[PDB]
Amino acid sequence: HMKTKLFINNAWIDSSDQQTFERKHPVSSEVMTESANATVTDAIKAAQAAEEAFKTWKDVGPSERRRLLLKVADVMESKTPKFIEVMAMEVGASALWAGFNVHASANVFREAASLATQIQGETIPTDKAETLSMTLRQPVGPILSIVPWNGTAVLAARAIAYPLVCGNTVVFKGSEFSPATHALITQCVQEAGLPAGVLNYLNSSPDRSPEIADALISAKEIRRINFTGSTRVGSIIAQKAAQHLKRCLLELGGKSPLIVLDDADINAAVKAAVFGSFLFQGQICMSTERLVVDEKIADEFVARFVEKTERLSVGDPCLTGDCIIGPMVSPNSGERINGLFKDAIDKGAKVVCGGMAQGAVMPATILDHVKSDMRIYDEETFGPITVVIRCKGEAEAIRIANDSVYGLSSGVFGRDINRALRVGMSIEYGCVHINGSTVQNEAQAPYGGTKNTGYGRFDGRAVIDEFTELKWLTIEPFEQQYPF
Amino acid sequence: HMKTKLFINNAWIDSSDQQTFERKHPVSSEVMTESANATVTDAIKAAQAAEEAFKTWKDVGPSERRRLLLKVADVMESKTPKFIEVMAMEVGASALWAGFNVHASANVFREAASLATQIQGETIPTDKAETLSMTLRQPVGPILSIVPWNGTAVLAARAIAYPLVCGNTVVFKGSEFSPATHALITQCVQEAGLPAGVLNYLNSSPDRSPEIADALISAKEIRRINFTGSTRVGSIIAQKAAQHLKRCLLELGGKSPLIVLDDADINAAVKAAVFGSFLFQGQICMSTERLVVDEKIADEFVARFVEKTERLSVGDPCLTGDCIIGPMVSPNSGERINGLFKDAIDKGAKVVCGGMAQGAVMPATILDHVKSDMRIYDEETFGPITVVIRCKGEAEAIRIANDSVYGLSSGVFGRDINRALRVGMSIEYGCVHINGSTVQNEAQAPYGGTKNTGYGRFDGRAVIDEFTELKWLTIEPFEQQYPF
Ligand SMILES: O=Cc1ccccc1O
Ligand SMILES: O=Cc1ccccc1O
Ligand SMILES: O=Cc1ccccc1O
């Protein structure tokens, strides 16, 4: 099995207590990766390293930053087969999802690289004579980046590339389910030639995660925090950062809906539905978790959806290829889903395809006639399961979409685009896709949600404000008048 | 004395329990204002009103928004003498500070008004064929705006004008020390012709403030929160908003320094020092609380500073004009200051001018040879007192400025501007003024701080993101390809 260490100051090291933790395969129990198990002591060492490196890193010019980041992308692409292999072992990712993760990661680093000269402020008019008024965008300092296991590569990449190009250094906290992959992405950054202490990598058993996080948030060195993960945990992180008045970029849960109006190209909508629902076993925060369909069209749409869905391949990508539905991440994922499943089913829901789960194994499942009294109506379910909510009319569609506690991604299918736009513009979502799937992300385009999905933004120009100080600076004449 | 009510749905009303609270003068104990004492019930009614009005207000066009806001400014200026009079009675503001507050308030509304057509998104390149990718900036919903008593008018104005032009409605929570002024600013908005429920006004006795705030933050109607006030309270507000994953604009405390290098135009620096230190009795969050001066120059600078400071007029603006040092806000302000004063004085500090306080009455006071072991070294002191920290060299100056737990405003005086810029650019402050005072604010320019000063920003273009939803929207072809 793979062996993985901590990374501080361009050095791969054991934890301060020489202790390890394992990532076992969720169905076979076979050890996939053994990782160094960081302590709080290690975490503080990581922050101190980041702080120290910041002293010179903040002054590195745009040309060098761009060159370095561009190189990271090149290096990540050069390691593509390893990423595919490791992601398949650790998080049951098919070659499709793994390969995409790499492309997306490399592209994030290139987009970030491109932004090097684009982190700009403004020169602003002032009534004051002989005075320059302007804004500057400067580096912040050490950033705490906490990254989950699902968008295994790209979620790390985004949480490194962007703070780097903004002149910051980062303490990267990886996932207990993905330690080989996160060590690997780190290694890529190392081989691109990033200065020592600019990127520091930590991973731990989940029993240690909270206190390691608390120590870093409470650490004077850490200036801002980005967190990607469950709303449940996100609130707790933000509550801690509030005790120290620290800004958070929160990238949390979703219940991303596909709105299928009575007008929809049913062929096209089914395709978007099948894709968005079951890519990476619905373990994407923006996976299509709802299909809100007009009653006039529902029966027909559901029939086609079910036909395609049943035909989808189930299996283990580390054992065999062409798996659409790989295993889930943990021998627990099905336990949560089944609780949601039973509740829905006892309240009138209808299994139109699939069945319940067991550990990390589940067939592609669709529930029809889901209603607002069922937990699964709005509770996020990280798995190859999705729900159909039927509705009557454009207004009720908007209502149902807007009644979610989340607001990450969404899709609206309708042949009348003027109409689709009305609903598209009225719904409370960070991402709206007119006649598109709910699973999209481009680096030029801001990525984030509203409500329980959090706040702040990765990607696009918007990510810059997340990792910069905005300073209002004036240059004034020596002689000026004062009231007293 | 003045009598003040609550404001909900274009209606001035008593609180749900017909209870009142008073603003007594901090030295005479005479009743200045009697205000309706809002209950939690009133607060929820306010949010519901704001939510309901949002339904139509979000769709009001840019032309009408601009016209309306422009009118608010006109209306506020038409009420200038009343503002002067009321602010003098409630918060001991001189005509200088009151008059400025009005101008600044009117200008905020005009700047906000101007921005109506400037709340823009982007059309973004995409690799995808036959696809439009773009960002939209849309309204958020009901905003909770909590406003203190010091920048009595402009701090309210900023917390209304901006959320309004962004298409939001607001629950405005005013200050217990400034209920007549905050009711007045509300009245101005009413007379400009804002639709019912777009602005709703609440005030209460301080014993009720926390729970009224908690109810509003926990309220489903309230989408985002801006808070201006003490770091102490700001953390608590943010902790509450974290429990509901709500974004905060935090505008908190400061220990704003004036850096006087060995190079400085001492005449010019003294003038900036005198102004920034003692405007409105140093009750501005950006009041000059530190004078970091080079030892080579300190003795001379301190001598001039003391000369000017002693000559400053003390008195009560509601009784007599030309008062530079009015009374402080509460018969308690001096109790906090004296604790800070004694500590400094017992640890070697030197009163070069002034003396201790009593209730809300204090002479202009300067302490010299303040060192890092004294509480007053970095603790904010809301009063006509300020401290001198001596230093040796450009590096040590930056260190001392950067060692504050706050980072709101700052000034750097030096005849070599290249040098002044080095320190100016290296210090961790939201506002840096090269050869300028620490007390500046223009509506075109972003206003905010780093660290314990909070996060987020009023004024400038930056304020727009605070009160808008940023949505990534795509318009895609019907026919497109999917991997599975
Ligand atoms: O929802 C999680 C996610 C978002 C963007 C890219 C990859 C991902 O797994
Ligand atoms: O406290 C809320 C909040 C708002 C914007 C950014 C970071 C935050 O923690
Ligand atoms: O520090 C408080 C403040 C900031 C901007 C304008 C007026 C004020 O009182």
TrEMBL record, chains A, B:
GO molecular function, one term: salicylaldehyde dehydrogenase (NAD+) activity
Enzyme type, top EC level: oxidoreductase
InterPro entries: Ald_DH/histidinol_DH, Ald_DH_C, Ald_DH_CS_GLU, Ald_DH_N, Aldehyde_DH_dom
Catalytic activity: salicylaldehyde + NAD(+) + H2O = salicylate + NADH + 2 H(+)
Listed Gene3D superfamilies: Aldehyde Dehydrogenase, Chain A, domain 1, Aldehyde Dehydrogenase, Chain A, domain 2
CDD domains: ALDH_SaliADH
Catalytic activity, EC: 1.2.1.65
Pathway: Aromatic compound metabolism; naphthalene degradation
Limits of the Aldehyde dehydrogenase domain: 12-472
UniProt entry keywords in alphabetical sequence: Aromatic hydrocarbons catabolism, NAD, Oxidoreductase, Plasmid
One Pfam family recorded for the sequence: Aldedh
PROSITE patterns per the UniProt record, alphabetical: ALDEHYDE_DEHYDR_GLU (PS00687)
Active-site residue numbers: 251
Keyword Oxidoreductase among record annotations: yes
SUPFAM superfamilies cross-referenced by the UniProt entry: ALDH-like
Similarity section: Belongs to the aldehyde dehydrogenase family.
Protein name per the record: Salicylaldehyde dehydrogenase
Organism, scientific name: Pseudomonas putida (Arthrobacter siderocapsulatus)
